[PDB]
Amino acid sequence: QPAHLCFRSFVEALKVDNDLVEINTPIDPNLEAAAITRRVCETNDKAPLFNNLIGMKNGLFRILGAPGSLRKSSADRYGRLARHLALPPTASMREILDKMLSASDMPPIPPTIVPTGPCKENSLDDSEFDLTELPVPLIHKSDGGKYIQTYGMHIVQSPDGTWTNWSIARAMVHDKNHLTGLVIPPQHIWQIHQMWKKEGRSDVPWALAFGVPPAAIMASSMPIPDGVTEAGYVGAMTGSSLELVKCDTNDLYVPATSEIVLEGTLSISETGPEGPFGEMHGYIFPGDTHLGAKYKVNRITYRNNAIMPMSSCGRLTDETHTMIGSLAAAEIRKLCQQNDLPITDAFAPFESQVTWVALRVDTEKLRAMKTTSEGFRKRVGDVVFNHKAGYTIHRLVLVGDDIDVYEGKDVLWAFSTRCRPGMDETLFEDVRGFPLIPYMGHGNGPAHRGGKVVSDALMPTEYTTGRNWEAADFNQSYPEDLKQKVLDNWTKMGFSHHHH
């Protein structure tokens, strides 16, 4: 099975890429696995595969950390993400995001039901498992529970059957047969949960599949539109119908090659303590426990020698930055274009802790609009901040065509030098806010509202007659022939490889 369609194959691909360290000595799921993974993520090292996890029994489970984190070299920086998608390991961010958007004007390719798959190699009923007895990791020392779920996909379906959503949302072990987790607006798991609650008749049929096809976990992390079944989107993106098997205890369908599957229900009535957790913005607030959604597990099925993927999230750089930020930015780019805004590119700078998105503007198109900064900022902010794809993003930075938004140094340069604080900005207080940002949920204002801004780093003539400067840099401040001469004589003179 190809790497993008089968997690086990993906692990092999990371090995073959010399992007994996197999650790075959005993490693403690209580902090040690996550500490190693955290160090990996902070240093862009090889992904760790913990084959000898203390507490592993009857095949449950090995751990792969850092599945979507960065590689050290520039040339294959995003290679792990490329390996989720059948792209060359040298693929650019633009190419990765274009691949993730490609299915947006394609017909869905619905999944194919098959009678069995590797995820059915082992099972444990309601009398055979205990979630507290599995080697579930404690990821950060102050976490309020052992977070089994950092890189699996929740599967829930609308009551009417017409939409099946796949998404990543955290969850931790509550007791032998329950999890608690985040289920918050405007997320699709929340939207579907609300439908079931308003119907009022039953708990939500649910499955949580770990070690799913990599292409599927990428879509699970992306805010594709309301009502769109991720499986068909992934089918279209990959050009292949995904093979799914029915759950044993409900009529949901899971990827055939899933490493581990939990089957059960998401309660429409019950809650339990959830969090705190060391989160994407780099913080944990110890003791901040709150009631979360409560999941009941009825059955576990799993592959022989099952592998659980894990995100040891926090400070830069991990899946919560590479995937949440970049994939939100991708959807925002498309949303802007669909609203007739002249946006060519979007990226969430890592430097902003993926709380900003930089929007590259086609300034020829902007000039033809014959508009102003005030007007344009308002229009862009209304489009983005009123939409779910803008949920996690609190600052939009508009930049002209000279800026590569995938290069944080250049975004910061433009922001710092082209956007006059206050005057060149529009604040948005009457929009949904992202409470997990510390300045929101632990800040001075409403946790769930406001705190958003559009910062216009377009210069005045970019709206009128065209850019009126040159950069004071090597590239722009010297003629071509001179630059080439300098380059050609550089080592000869005495001054100081692409792959590395």
Ligand X SMILES: CC1=C(C(=O)O)[C@@H]2CC(C)(C)c3c(C)c(C)cc4c3N2[C@@]12C(=O)NC(=O)N=C2N4C[C@H](O)[C@H](O)[C@H](O)COP(=O)(O)O
- 279 belongs to the binding site for a second copy (CB under 8 A): yes
Beta bridge partners of residue 209, listed in sequence order: 153, 261
- 452 belongs to the binding site for a second copy (CB under 8 A): yes
Binds 173: which of ligand X, K ion, Mn ion, none (CB < 5-8 Å by kind): none
Nearer to ligand X, 60 or 182 (CB): 182
- 164 belongs to the binding site for Mn ion (CB under 5 A): no
- 221 belongs to the binding site for Mn ion (CB under 5 A): no
Q: Which two tokens stand for residue 32?
A: 């040690």
Nearer to K ion, 220 or 265 (CB): 220
The site for a second copy, by CB under 8 A, has a size of 88
State the catalytic residue, choosing from 243, 259, 279, 462. Answer: 279
Least Å from the CB of residue 50 to ligand X:
17
Under 8 Å between Cβ of 328 and 352: no
Q: Name the site residues for ligand X (rule: CB under 6 A).
A: 150-151, 165, 167-170, 182, 184, 187-189, 221-223, 277, 279-280, 311, 313, 319-320, 323-324, 436
Q: Which two tokens stand for residue 402?
A: 């000279």
Q: Which of 74, 162, 269, 444 binds a second copy (CB under 8 A)?
A: 444
CB atoms within 10 A of CB 45: 18
9 torsion bin: left (phi>0), alpha (psi -120 to 50), beta (else): alpha
Rounded distance, CA 499 to CA 98, Å? 24
Q: Which of 17, 424, 425, 462 binds K ion (CB under 5 A)?
A: 424
Q: Is 170 annotated as a binding residue?
A: yes
Least Å from the CB of residue 230 to Mn ion:
6
The site for K ion, by CB under 5 A, has a size of 5
Least Å from the CB of residue 167 to Mn ion:
6
Q: Is 206 annotated as a binding residue?
A: no
- 331 belongs to the binding site for K ion (CB under 5 A): no
Nearer to Mn ion, 150 or 165 (CB): 165
Rounded distance, CA 318 to CA 270, Å? 32
Rounded distance, CA 276 to CA 142, Å? 7
Q: Which two tokens stand for residue 245?
A: 């098997």
Q: Which of 165, 229, 353, 426 binds Mn ion (CB under 5 A)?
A: 165
Q: Is 187 annotated as a binding residue?
A: yes
Tell me the torsion sign for CA atoms 414, 461, 344, 90: negative
Binds 161: which of ligand X, a second copy, K ion, none (CB < 5-8 Å by kind): none
Closest among 117, 125, 156, 151 to 11, alpha carbons compared? 151
Q: Which of 31, 124, 195, 369 binds a second copy (CB under 8 A)?
A: 31
Cα 170 to the center of its chain, rounded Å:
12
Rounded distance, CA 271 to CA 179, Å? 10
Binds 441: which of a second copy, ligand X, Mn ion, none (CB < 5-8 Å by kind): none
Rounded distance, CA 299 to CA 128, Å? 9
Rounded distance, CA 462 to CA 460, Å? 5
- 62 belongs to the binding site for a second copy (CB under 8 A): no
- 459 belongs to the binding site for a second copy (CB under 8 A): yes
Q: Which of 149, 158, 167, 311 binds K ion (CB under 5 A)?
A: 167
Residue 351 annotated in active site: no
Mode of pairing for the β-strands spanning 253-255 and 62-65: unpaired
Rounded distance, CA 280 to CA 282, Å? 5
Of the candidate spans 25-33, 39-47, 158-166, 313-321, the one that interacts with Mn ion by CB under 5 A turns out to be: 158-166
Site map 174..213 versus Mn ion, x via CB under 5 A: --------------x-------------------------
Rounded distance, CA 244 to CA 222, Å? 20
Nearer to Mn ion, 216 or 403 (CB): 216
- 39 belongs to the binding site for a second copy (CB under 8 A): yes
Q: Which residue has the tokens 């780019």?
A: 333
Under 8 Å between Cβ of 180 and 171: yes
Least Å from the CB of residue 205 to Mn ion:
17
Q: CA of 259: how far to CAs of 84, 148, 246, 498, in Å?
A: 16, 14, 15, 37
366 torsion bin: left (phi>0), alpha (psi -120 to 50), beta (else): alpha
Rounded distance, CA 185 to CA 432, Å? 9
Site residues (CB under 8 A) for a second copy, limited to 359-418: 373, 394-395, 409, 412-413, 416-418
Amino acid at 431: V
Site residues (CB under 8 A) for a second copy, limited to 129-188: 140-142
Residues belonging to the active site? 279
List residues near Mn ion by CB under 5 A.
165, 188
List residues near K ion by CB under 5 A.
167, 220, 419, 424, 456
